[PDB]
Design a protein around this motif. Sequence first.
Motif, short mmCIF file in Angstrom:
data_model
loop_
_atom_site.label_atom_id
_atom_site.label_comp_id
_atom_site.label_asym_id
_atom_site.label_seq_id
_atom_site.Cartn_x
_atom_site.Cartn_y
_atom_site.Cartn_z
N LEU A 182 -10.42 -0.44 -5.48
CA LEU A 182 -9.47 -1.48 -5.14
C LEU A 182 -9.26 -1.61 -3.63
O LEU A 182 -8.84 -2.68 -3.16
N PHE A 183 -9.53 -0.55 -2.85
CA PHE A 183 -9.43 -0.61 -1.40
C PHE A 183 -10.77 -0.26 -0.77
O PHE A 183 -10.84 0.54 0.17
N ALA A 184 -11.84 -0.83 -1.32
CA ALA A 184 -13.17 -0.64 -0.77
C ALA A 184 -13.21 -1.03 0.70
O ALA A 184 -13.32 -0.18 1.59
N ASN A 185 -13.09 -2.31 0.99
CA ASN A 185 -13.10 -2.76 2.38
C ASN A 185 -11.69 -2.97 2.91
O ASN A 185 -11.29 -4.03 3.40
N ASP A 186 -10.92 -1.88 2.81
CA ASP A 186 -9.68 -1.72 3.55
C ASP A 186 -9.81 -0.35 4.22
O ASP A 186 -9.61 0.68 3.58
N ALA A 187 -10.20 -0.36 5.50
CA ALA A 187 -10.24 0.88 6.26
C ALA A 187 -8.84 1.39 6.53
O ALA A 187 -8.63 2.59 6.78
N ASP A 188 -7.85 0.49 6.47
CA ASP A 188 -6.47 0.89 6.70
C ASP A 188 -5.95 1.78 5.59
O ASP A 188 -5.17 2.71 5.86
N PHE A 189 -6.36 1.54 4.35
CA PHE A 189 -5.80 2.29 3.23
C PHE A 189 -6.06 3.79 3.38
O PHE A 189 -5.12 4.59 3.30
N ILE A 190 -7.32 4.19 3.60
CA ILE A 190 -7.63 5.61 3.76
C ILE A 190 -6.72 6.24 4.80
O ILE A 190 -6.06 7.26 4.56
N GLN A 191 -6.68 5.65 5.99
CA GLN A 191 -5.78 6.14 7.03
C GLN A 191 -4.35 6.19 6.52
O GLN A 191 -3.66 7.21 6.64
N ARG A 192 -3.89 5.09 5.93
CA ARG A 192 -2.51 5.00 5.48
C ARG A 192 -2.18 6.11 4.49
O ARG A 192 -1.13 6.74 4.59
N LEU A 193 -3.12 6.40 3.58
CA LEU A 193 -2.91 7.44 2.58
C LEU A 193 -2.92 8.81 3.22
O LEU A 193 -2.07 9.66 2.93
N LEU A 194 -3.91 9.05 4.08
CA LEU A 194 -4.09 10.39 4.61
C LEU A 194 -2.89 10.78 5.46
O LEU A 194 -2.42 11.93 5.38
N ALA A 195 -2.34 9.83 6.21
CA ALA A 195 -1.18 10.12 7.04
C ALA A 195 -0.02 10.60 6.18
O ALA A 195 0.38 11.77 6.27
N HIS A 196 0.53 9.70 5.36
CA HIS A 196 1.55 10.07 4.38
C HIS A 196 0.92 10.83 3.19
O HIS A 196 0.90 12.08 3.14
N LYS A 230 0.83 -1.20 0.00
CA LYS A 230 0.00 0.00 0.00
C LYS A 230 0.86 1.24 0.00
O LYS A 230 0.62 2.17 -0.79
N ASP A 231 1.90 1.27 0.85
CA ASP A 231 2.79 2.43 0.90
C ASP A 231 3.32 2.78 -0.49
O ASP A 231 3.16 3.91 -0.97
N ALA A 232 3.93 1.80 -1.16
CA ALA A 232 4.46 2.05 -2.50
C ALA A 232 3.40 2.61 -3.44
O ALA A 232 3.70 3.47 -4.27
N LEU A 233 2.15 2.14 -3.32
CA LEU A 233 1.07 2.67 -4.16
C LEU A 233 0.75 4.11 -3.79
O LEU A 233 0.67 5.00 -4.65
#
Length: 48
Positions: A34-48, A9-12
């Motif tokens: 592609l990250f519909a039911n990944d609540a982690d992705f939104i957080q992961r993106l917004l942070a970085h 996810k980070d690399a993306l």
Amino acid sequence: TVEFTGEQKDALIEKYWEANEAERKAIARAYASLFANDADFIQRLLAH
């Protein structure tokens, strides 16, 4: 969907923020389904 590791996810996410405004709309649409039911992705993106 398919699962991605955290480093995957980070690399993306790295690519999204490097994209320009008009391109961010193309990529964010892609990632959004592609990250519909990944609540982690939104957080992961917004942070970085």
